[PDB]
Every structure is written in structure tokens, then in C-alpha cells.
Curated annotation (Swiss-Prot):
This is Lysine-specific histone demethylase 1A. It comes from the Eukaryota. The gene is KDM1A. Disulfide bonds: none annotated. Belongs to the flavin monoamine oxidase family. The SWIRM domain may act as an anchor site for a histone tail. Residues 13-112 form the SWIRM domain. Acetylated by KAT8 in epithelial but not in mesenchymal cells, thereby regulating the epithelial-to-mesenchymal transition. Acetylation by KAT8 reduces KDM1A association with nucleosomes, thereby decreasing histone H3 demethylation, leading to transcription activatio of target genes. Polyubiquitinated by JADE2; which leads to its proteasomal degradation. Deubiquitinated by USP38; preventing it from degradation by the 26S proteasome. Signal peptide: none annotated. Component of a histone demethylase complex with RCOR1. Component of a RCOR/GFI/KDM1A/HDAC complex. Interacts directly with GFI1 and GFI1B. Interacts with INSM1 (via N-terminus). Component of a BHC histone deacetylase complex that contains HDAC1, HDAC2, HMG20B, KDM1A, RCOR1 and PHF21A. The BHC complex may also contain ZMYM2, ZNF217, ZMYM3, GSE1 and GTF2I. In the complex, RCOR1/CoREST strongly enhances the demethylase activity and protects it from the proteasome while PHF21A/BHC80 inhibits the demethylase activity. Interacts with the androgen receptor (AR).
Length: 124
């Protein structure tokens, strides 16, 4: 895959994307499907969204001990990103729903490695 030289040092907001196998400059098949208006908008709009997501992950990676509410993310966010609340609401969702955030603070519907879990299917 992508090879080269980076070194041994962390990264600001961008780093948030690194962890995720996806371009922090453009959108992916998923993001495009979830946010049609964004992908079908001006370079500006696209960036605005690509920034709201990355940022959301930052705050989450810093305080992943607690659930990241939509409000908090917005307040912390800086316009024009936060300006469009509708976006911050659609972005923060795609993440949580995709298990990209708030997945280690509350016990919500989710599978787990169990010793061959099984209630007792008869199917016969």
C-alpha cells in the first residue's frame, strides 16, 4: 500500500483520519452515499463536511471515556463547520452508527466474543 517516510510523531486533526483507511481530503463511496448534497456540492461544502467528521473524532479520541453528544461536538466545532447544524447531526451519526465513535462508554446493542454462544436451536 502507501509507502514512504513519516517518522515518529503524532498529528492534529488529520491524525483522526489516519486511523481510518480513507482520504481526509476527499469523500468515499460511503460518505458520498450518506451525504449526496455534500459530494454533489462545491469544493467548499465538501471540505466543510470532511472537517466536521475528522474534528468529531478528535474530541472523541481525547475524551472517549464519555459519550459524545451532538451538542458538545457542535459547540466545540468552529464554523462555518458548526454553522450548518444539519450537517453536524448527519456527520456525528454516520460515525456512531458506523461504530466510529461512542463505542466504548455505554453498553449498547453490540456483539462480543463469546465461548461459542448459543441458546439452543432445534431446526428439526
Amino acid at each position: 500500500g502507501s509507502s514512504g517516510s513519516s517518522g515518529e510523531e503524532p498529528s492534529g486533526v488529520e491524525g483522526a483520519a489516519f486511523q481510518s483507511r480513507l482520504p481526509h481530503d476527499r469523500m468515499t463511496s460511503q460518505e458520498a452515499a450518506c451525504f449526496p448534497d455534500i459530494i454533489s456540492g462545491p469544493q467548499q461544502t465538501q471540505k466543510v463536511f470532511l472537517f466536521i467528521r475528522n474534528r468529531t473524532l478528535q474530541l472523541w479520541l481525547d475524551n472517549p471515556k464519555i459519550q459524545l453528544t451532538f451538542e458538545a461536538t457542535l459547540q466545540q466545532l468552529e464554523a462555518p463547520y458548526n454553522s450548518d447544524t444539519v450537517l453536524v447531526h448527519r456527520v456525528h451519526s454516520y460515525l456512531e452508527r458506523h461504530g466510529l465513535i461512542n463505542f466504548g462508554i455505554y453498553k449498547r446493542i453490540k456483539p462480543l466474543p463469546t465461548k461459542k454462544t448459543g441458546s439452543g436451536p432445534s431446526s428439526g
